[PDB]
Design a protein around this ligand. Structure first.
Ligand SMILES: CC(=O)N[C@H]1[C@@H](OP(=O)(O)O)O[C@H](CO)[C@@H](O)[C@@H]1O
Ligand SMILES: OCCc1ccc(O)cc1
Ligand SMILES: OCCc1ccc(O)cc1
Ligand SMILES: [Mg+2]
Length: 473
């Protein structure tokens, strides 16, 4: 294990930093436990922890308008000829092996109450497919469509960001499913980083006598993680130029959506993002807007209930701020090549939490009654203000085709397994109907390997399908 000299130098650092309590139980640790504590403490800089705690617990003490029209767009307002062109252009970029996907799948799904990673969840479709599998098959299908135009292999590498709680069960799940028919060599599971949890008094919390309480560093942890994992280097080696980044929990996510990629690429933006119309004042969504001349987002946990209810001057029964973030982002690869210059600039969001820890005295593991500390998180959209308005685009899409998050346990009424299932099977039915199918009957599941977004269903014209149904290969 670590030498006595190594250990004393670490202890000095932490003690000088006012964090020497992390060594309170060293004298009763086994060799292994002492080794773990040494290595874990060595991974943090206690002076930086003090910097973070200070900014969080003693923060320094609203030019806030809707995004201007130059930076916004809407599928509803689009010329269908342009939609067709951007689709074709996106598919051509996929065919050129220029498109990558980053999946943010490090969330714990604590509102959901599942023991498995959220992506593994079965929302009760006829197929019993997981969110992960549905997403993988969307990638597979787009590759197939792209190969029809190129006559060459089309690959969309899938970079799956997990946390400590999610990584091993995620990798096992992918292996057990043989990567859902994608090539293992083009799917990379990597981990985001963590930050120490900090007490209300600014002290590192000890989960045990030999372990610091940590949490994942928020989805804004993506950027630093792309470097350390080797993912950015892999994207460079493959000639990636366009990246779609999204959240695992959206059962309708149009993975590597070619219209979105084609549109972004055509406008030559650094960053593009999708929104839907906020469904009410209390919806738990970030709001995309202009702050101090800059594109920005106000998260639902940080907005004041006055700006959430701010009504349109012209239309007093409609909300001023209603561009709901659906966690569907486009980046240029050039944007990723500059991460090192601004990753440190991202703010740390503060959440007060009940962090299980050791009774600072006994050493007994105790679940606190009231919030005893804070967790720090970076948010993926806090890059938006680094980007000029002219290199940013915010597009409205249709909720019922694009956004159906799995947030809550079954039996909630909203953003749960039942709404997810309903939205998927309603989507399938609408596509079949538009293609001339007659659905008797609620809804029909259409496999992504049959249809990515409504195409390829001509074979169903005139046919009668008894709902509920599952259309597959
Ligand atoms: C940091 C981040 O990405 N937050 C997102 C994300 O919130 P969650 O706290 O992860 O549920 O998903 C929302 C959509 O479901 C979106 O509106 C919000 O801004
Ligand atoms: O990079 C994470 C640091 C770390 C090292 C060893 C541990 O046992 C725990 C955490
Ligand atoms: O003008 C809006 C075109 C557009 C439509 C849908 C997308 O997903 C992206 C861009
Ligand atoms: Mg792999």
């Amino acid at each position: 294990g670590p030498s006595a000299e190594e250990f004393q130098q670490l202890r000095k650092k932490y003690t000088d930093a006012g964090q020497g309590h992390v060594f309170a139980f060293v004298d009763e640790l086994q060799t292994g436990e002492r080794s773990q504590l040494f290595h874990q403490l060595s991974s943090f800089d206690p002076v930086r922890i003090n910097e973070l705690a200070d900014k969080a617990l003693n923060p320094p003490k609203a030019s806030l308008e809707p995004l201007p029209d130059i930076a916004t767009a809407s599928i509803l307002d689009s010329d269908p000829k342009d939609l067709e062109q951007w689709y074709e252009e996106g598919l051509k970029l996929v065919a050129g092996n220029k498109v990558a996907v980053v999946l943010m799948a490090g969330g714990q799904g604590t509102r959901l109450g599942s023991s498995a990673p959220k992506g593994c969840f079965d929302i009760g479709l006829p197929s019993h497919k997981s969110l992960f599998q549905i997403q993988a098959e969307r990638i597979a299908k787009l590759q197939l469509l792209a190969q029809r135009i190129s006559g060459k292999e089309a690959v969309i590498p899938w970079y799956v960001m997990t946390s400590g709680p999610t990584r091993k069960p995620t990798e096992e799940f992918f292996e057990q499913h043989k990567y859902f028919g994608l090539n293992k060599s083009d799917v990379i599971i990597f981990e985001q980083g963590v930050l120490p949890c900090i007490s209300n008094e600014g002290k590192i919390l000890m989960e045990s006598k030999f372990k610091v309480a940590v949490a994942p560093d928020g989805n804004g942890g993506i950027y630093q993680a792309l470097l350390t994992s080797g993912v950015r280097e892999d994207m460079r080696k493959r000639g990636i130029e366009h990246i779609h980044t999204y959240c695992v929990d959206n059962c309708l996510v149009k993975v590597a959506d070619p219209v979105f990629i084609g549109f972004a690429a055509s406008k030559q933006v650094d960053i593009a993002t999708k929104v839907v119309r906020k469904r009410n004042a209390t919806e738990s969504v970030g709001l995309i807007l202009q702050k101090n001349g800059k594109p920005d987002v106000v998260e639902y946990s940080e907005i004041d209930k006055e700006t959430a209810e701010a009504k349109d001057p012209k239309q007093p029964d409609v909300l001023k701020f209603r561009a709901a973030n659906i966690v569907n982002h486009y980046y240029s690869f050039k944007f990723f090549e500059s991460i090192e210059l601004w990753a440190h600039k991202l703010p740390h969001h503060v959440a007060r939490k009940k962090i299980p820890c050791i009774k600072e005295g006994t050493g007994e593991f105790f679940k606190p009654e009231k919030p005893n500390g804070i967790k720090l998180e970076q948010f993926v959209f806090d890059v938006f203000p680094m980007t000029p308005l002219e290199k940013f685009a915010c597009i409205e899409v249709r909720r019922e085709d694009e956004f159906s998050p799995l947030k809550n346990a079954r039996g909630t009424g909203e953003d749960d397994p039942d709404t997810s299932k309903r939205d998927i099977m309603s989507q399938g039915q609408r596509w079949i109907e538009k293609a001339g199918g007659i659905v008797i009957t609620v809804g029909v599941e259409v496999s992504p390997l049959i249809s990515y977004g409504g195409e390829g269903l001509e074979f169903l014209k005139g046919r009668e399908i008894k709902a509920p149904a599952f259309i597959e290969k």
